Design a protein around this ligand. Sequence first.
Ligand SMILES: Cc1cc2nc3c(=O)[nH]c(=O)nc-3n(C[C@H](O)[C@H](O)[C@H](O)CO)c2cc1N(C)C
Ligand SMILES: Cc1cc2nc3c(=O)[nH]c(=O)nc-3n(C[C@H](O)[C@H](O)[C@H](O)CO)c2cc1N(C)C
Ligand SMILES: Cc1cc2nc3c(=O)[nH]c(=O)nc-3n(C[C@H](O)[C@H](O)[C@H](O)CO)c2cc1N(C)C
Ligand SMILES: Cc1cc2nc3c(=O)[nH]c(=O)nc-3n(C[C@H](O)[C@H](O)[C@H](O)CO)c2cc1N(C)C
Lengths: 200, 197, 199
Amino acid sequence: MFTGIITDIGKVDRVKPLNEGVLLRIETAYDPETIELGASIACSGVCLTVVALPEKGSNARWFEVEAWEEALRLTTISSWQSGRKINLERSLKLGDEMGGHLVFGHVDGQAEIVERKDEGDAVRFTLRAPEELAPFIAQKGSVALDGTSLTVNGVNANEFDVLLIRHSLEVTTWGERKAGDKVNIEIDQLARYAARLAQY
Amino acid sequence: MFTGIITDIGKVDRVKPLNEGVLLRIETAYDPETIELGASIACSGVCLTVVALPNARWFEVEAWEEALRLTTISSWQSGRKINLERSLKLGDEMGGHLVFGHVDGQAEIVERKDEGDAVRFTLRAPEELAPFIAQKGSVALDGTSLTVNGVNANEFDVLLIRHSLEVTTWGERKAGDKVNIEIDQLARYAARLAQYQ
Amino acid sequence: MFTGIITDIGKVDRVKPLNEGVLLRIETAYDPETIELGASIACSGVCLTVVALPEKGSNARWFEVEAWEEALRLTTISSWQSGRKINLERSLKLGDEMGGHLVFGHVDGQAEIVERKDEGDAVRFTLRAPEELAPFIAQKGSVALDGTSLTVNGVNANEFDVLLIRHSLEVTTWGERKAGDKVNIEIDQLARYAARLAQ
Ligand SMILES: Cc1cc2nc3c(=O)[nH]c(=O)nc-3n(C[C@H](O)[C@H](O)[C@H](O)CO)c2cc1N(C)C
Ligand SMILES: Cc1cc2nc3c(=O)[nH]c(=O)nc-3n(C[C@H](O)[C@H](O)[C@H](O)CO)c2cc1N(C)C
Ligand SMILES: Cc1cc2nc3c(=O)[nH]c(=O)nc-3n(C[C@H](O)[C@H](O)[C@H](O)CO)c2cc1N(C)C
Ligand SMILES: Cc1cc2nc3c(=O)[nH]c(=O)nc-3n(C[C@H](O)[C@H](O)[C@H](O)CO)c2cc1N(C)C
């Protein structure tokens, strides 16, 4: 589990073809001596499992994950090539506060940035989502976009706004985001369960 | 508490009947020196208390009435492989979701489909547990933290990644097999808020 | 941080009014040599900072803590007089086992015991939760009551049930608890999260 507070911008260094999947080697600022095999790392919102790390005597910092059909088809990972910059977050540890918005890394789908506008040193992103996700995108609600926890600023039908502050633009991949880009979206877990209850 | 990330495949070595319960000796890769009496270990999702310990690597647990009735443990015999997870220690990563090891019942695998080196399992849960199973929500099946990828009534599908197929008992699971299901406790919190309102 | 496994039953030795607070001296079975000034100890669920220990040469076993406006208002501490027995738990370190659940020692309020019923192996305590906390107390969830890690066995409107096993009655202050008694309540992490999103 995660909070949607991005702590590193990883870079996809190597892409290798697997049997209906891909092997991703992701360069990171994280110390590999703090990562265990089988650990969960959120990669632009997608929870992925570490399968390989550098040898103990290596100076290089990276981790390897394997993305399979579900992650490939639903998330932006299908378009990830060598050089791609991604948001990274380590898993919450027992003892850590849960905060105001839990992110689990099971991405619901994708939203498209349809407009990008500067507002001082901040940037307003207008996005469109699939109809199915619209009931979950609510005013003042929290949502994870590319693994980044963000407040829904304005909403118009299937379109909604998020306001990204200068700091968030610097430490995440959001600074390079352009109109037309796809981002991973994860709705709130509590709202998800509340809605599933309501249909009964 | 647990997180649904399996760290060992244990083997049931001894099964001894008791008064309204069973005694189980599980062979494990866990170091007995790291285990104390009274410790909680999730055995294929079922939270059981260690009652007996030994260089030999094993622990003993007792499954009572509720556990034997609700879970797959009633079918556990010598030779059976089970998923194992240690209780979270302070500072341990909660890589899945919050898993408590109170199994709500049994789910039956209705379909196993190969997806390259990953495997899609379609399962059928009890009707009572269906409202707690949401699309792209979490579930613990045989103690494994998994995303519900699609849901249709009481039927749902999960995808088992290569790594998990290697380090868990899921690699040998087939259609017809029953698994332990713990619904997300967070879904129970949602139900409580809806009940109050 | 704490887990809700009580390791000593302390006795409130003295209570002294302070400027906007109260000083408490608590008699303990803990070795004062293993306690440092500034250490966190859960006192019937309430996380408190050690402000004083016995002097050099002294063989006495006590520690002093100070309770401020929030602790005095929200918790049972305002009622603590000399002789009062309280649950004690030491703060855990990185890598320590967590046999209860995650307990921060930030008490949310007071729950009142309404019923105590002996059921052989365990004693069933029925409690009334504060109105604000009740919607976030759910079956199978964990609760810290007087710092004791307990499972919510069932919920009935503003009331809920907990089961206390014989060992817990022996090692905690729950052995002397009766109907009408107010206990400290801290809801677990999922409950706290649900309470945060609703408010
Ligand atoms: C609930 C919540 C909402 C947030 N909303 C926003 C937001 O609307 N805009 C923004 O630039 N940054 C945000 N943030 C902060 C960003 O998530 C972080 O700055 C980035 O992940 C980089 O660490 C929010 C954080 C939150 N936490 C408490 C879970
Ligand atoms: C703990 C955890 C680990 C996961 N590891 C992987 C993984 O290693 N490869 C993969 O393709 N998909 C994974 N997934 C599933 C992907 O995150 C989802 O398929 C995408 O987010 C799309 O929903 C994992 C999920 C997990 N839980 C927490 C949600
Ligand atoms: C900490 C803990 C220890 C438990 N130990 C045992 C146990 O030792 N034997 C047993 O039959 N059932 C147990 N249980 C209850 C079993 O996990 C449940 O009966 C089964 O999962 C079926 O719901 C324990 C439960 C616990 N928490 C989660 C409340
Ligand atoms: C590390 C820590 C130390 C604390 N020390 C004290 C303290 O020394 N006195 C006090 O009145 N309240 C305290 N508090 C706050 C009290 O525990 C809360 O006011 C009560 O539990 C009521 O919420 C401390 C809290 C702490 N963390 C866990 C949050």
